[PDB]
Amino acid sequence: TIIFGFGG
């Protein structure tokens, strides 16, 4: 993801 700390 494009959320810091959340892969993918």
Strand element count = 0
Radius of gyration: 4 Å
- Please estimate the helix content: under 10%
How far is the N terminus from the C terminus?
A: 4 Å
Q: In DSSP terms, counting alpha (H) and pi (I) runs of 4 or more, how many helices?
A: 0
| Shape summary | flat
Largest sheet: none
> What portion of the residues fall into strands of 2 or more residues?
under 5%
Structural class category: little secondary structure
Describe the structure.
By secondary structure, the protein is mostly loops. It is 0% helix and 0% strand. It has no helix or strand. The protein is flat, with a radius of gyration of 4 Å. The termini are close together.
Quickly list its features.
monomeric, 0% helix, plant protein, little secondary structure, flat, cyclic peptide
List the helices and strands and how they pair.
Elements (H helix, E strand, L loop, with lengths): L8
PDB class: plant protein
Keywords: cyclic peptide, plant protein
Assembly: monomeric
Question: What's the quick description here?
Answer:
The chain has 8 residues and is low in regular secondary structure.
